[PDB]
């Protein structure tokens, strides 16, 4: 069983057009209490309903900071962003080289690394068992994993090598930029792909990890088990290992295969659904909000 599965939704900013910025199709009622949102007369209830006005910092301290504590205690954690293309999934997870953006725009990734490094260094006040931080960067393109940090980022990995990909040591949270830069210049991107940057925290006898998952939004237009294979697999997993058991379908997809060591008992899984405020994307927003409902239900 998974220690906890949380669902969060973040409304994308409304792009003004010729100075005019129309109202969002997404609504947050006075009783939302930071957990519910109304769309198309449908009110969805989640653990976190963030309006486009929320800042990176506020979204991080509420949604991720908690997980950092769990990671340092030794638990496996995973934060996954999914949703329609252009809704700020990449922006929110912080997949772009930090030194290239402004502080108030930094995403989860660098913010989490700052807290991890701060608390780990906080253990120097009482220098005890040595600790080491690592980072791995994996890309998924056409149901095939690619180690963007190795010397063969062009060669598709195997089911075994996946949980063995290269882990580069991090002495300072500032080493992040390097890792992200190298990975970007090694990725394949069909022309759309998923990314997984895992922050590893290891001791002489323990290995905990925090997976930052940045799913790509579908490419093109859709016709007027019908979405991301990975998404379906995670729910199928959570549900499976959530009553009986006995063979968890980690092999149903590369995503659940790569995150197999994290999608275990007492681990943590958090979804961050990104939706568009535009009306022309209603069909997409509802589909995205409904999956999250399924995910929640899977318990």
Ligand X SMILES: Nc1ncnc2c1ncn2[C@@H]1O[C@H](COP(=O)(O)OP(=O)(O)NP(=O)(O)O)[C@@H](O)[C@H]1O
Residues making up the annotated binding site for ATP are 83-90
Helix (H, G, I), strand (E, B), or coil: what is residue 292? helix
**How far apart, in Å, are the Cα atoms of 45 and each of 10, 66, 81, 129, 294?**
13, 20, 18, 43, 12
Q: How far is the CB of 178 from ligand X (least distance, A)?
A: 21
User: Contact between 85 and ligand X (CB under 6 A)?
Assistant: yes
Window 160-199: contact mask with ligand X (x via CB under 6 A): ----------------------------------------
288 touches ligand X by CB under 6 A: no
136 binds Mg ion (CB under 5 A): no
CB of 160 to ligand X, least distance (A): 29
Beta bridge partners of 200: 134, 209
Q: Which two tokens stand for residue 282?
A: 């209603």
Smallest separation (angstroms) from ligand X to the CB of 129:
38
Residue with Cβ nearer ligand X (12 or 67): 12
How many other CB atoms are there within 10 angstroms of residue 190's CB atom?
9
Q: What is the CA radius of gyration of the chain?
A: 19
Count how many Cα atoms sit within 13 Å of the Cα of residue 162 in the half-sphere of its side chain. Answer: 22
- Using CB under 5 A as the binding rule, whether residue 90 contacts Mg ion is answered as yes
133 vs 216 by CB, closer to ligand X: 216
Q: Of 82-90, 150-158, 177-185, 249-257, which part binds ligand X (CB under 6 A)?
A: 82-90
Q: Which of 24, 76, 78, 90 binds ligand X (CB under 6 A)?
A: 90
Binding residue numbers: 83-90
Residue nearer to Mg ion on the CB measure, 90 or 270 = 90
Bridge partners of 290, per DSSP, are none
- C-alpha distances (whole Å) from 81 to each of 14, 93, 118, 223, 271 are 19, 7, 25, 24, 6
E strand intervals along the chain: 4-11, 26-27, 36-39, 42-45, 48-50, 77-83, 132-140, 145-147, 168-170, 194-202, 207-214, 268-275
| Binding segment (CB under 5 A) for Mg ion, from list 82-90, 204-212, 261-269, 285-293 | 82-90
Scanning 89-97, 175-183, 218-226, 230-238 for contacts with Mg ion by CB under 5 A, the matching segment is 89-97
Question: Using CB under 6 A, which of the segments 86-94, 116-124, 127-135, 153-161 binds ligand X?
Answer: 86-94
Site residues (vs ligand X, CB under 6 A): 12-13, 85-91, 216-217, 274
């Amino acid at each position: 069983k998974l220690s906890a599965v949380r669902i969060a939704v973040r409304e994308a900013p409304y792009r003004q057009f010729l100075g005019r910025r129309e109202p969002s199709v997404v609504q947050f009622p006075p009783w939302s209490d930071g957990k519910s949102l109304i769309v198309d007369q449908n009110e969805f209830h989640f653990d976190h309903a963030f309006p486009a006005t929320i800042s990176q910092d506020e979204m991080y301290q509420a949604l991720i900071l908690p997980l950092v504590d769990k990671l340092l205690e030794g638990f496996q954690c995973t934060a996954l962003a999914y949703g329609q293309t252009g809704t700020g999934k990449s922006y929110s997870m912080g997949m772009t080289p930090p030194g290239e953006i402004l502080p108030e725009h930094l995403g989860i990734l660098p913010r989490a690394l700052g807290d991890i490094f701060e608390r780990v260094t906080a253990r120097q006040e009482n220098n005890k068992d040595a600790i080491q931080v690592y980072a791995s960067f994996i890309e998924i393109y056409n149901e095939k994993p690619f180690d963007l940090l190795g010397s063969t980022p062009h060669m598709p990995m195997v089911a075994a090598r996946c949980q063995r990909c290269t882990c580069l040591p991090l002495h300072s949270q500032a080493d992040l930029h390097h890792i992200l830069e190298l990975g970007t210049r090694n990725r394949r991107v069909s022309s759309r792909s998923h990314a997984i940057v895992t922050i590893h925290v290891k001791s002489k006898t323990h290995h905990s990890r925090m997976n930052i998952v940045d799913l790509a939004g579908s490419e093109g237009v859709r016709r007027t088990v019908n979405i991301n294979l990975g998404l379906l697999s995670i729910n199928k997993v959570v549900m499976s290992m959530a009553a009986g058991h006995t063979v968890i379908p980690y092999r149903d997809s590369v995503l659940t295969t790569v995150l197999q060591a994290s999608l275990t008992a007492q681990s943590y899984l958090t979804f961050l659904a990104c939706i568009s405020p535009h009306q022309c994307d209603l069909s997409e927003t509802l589909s995205t909000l409904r999956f999250g409902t399924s995910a929640k239900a899977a318990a």
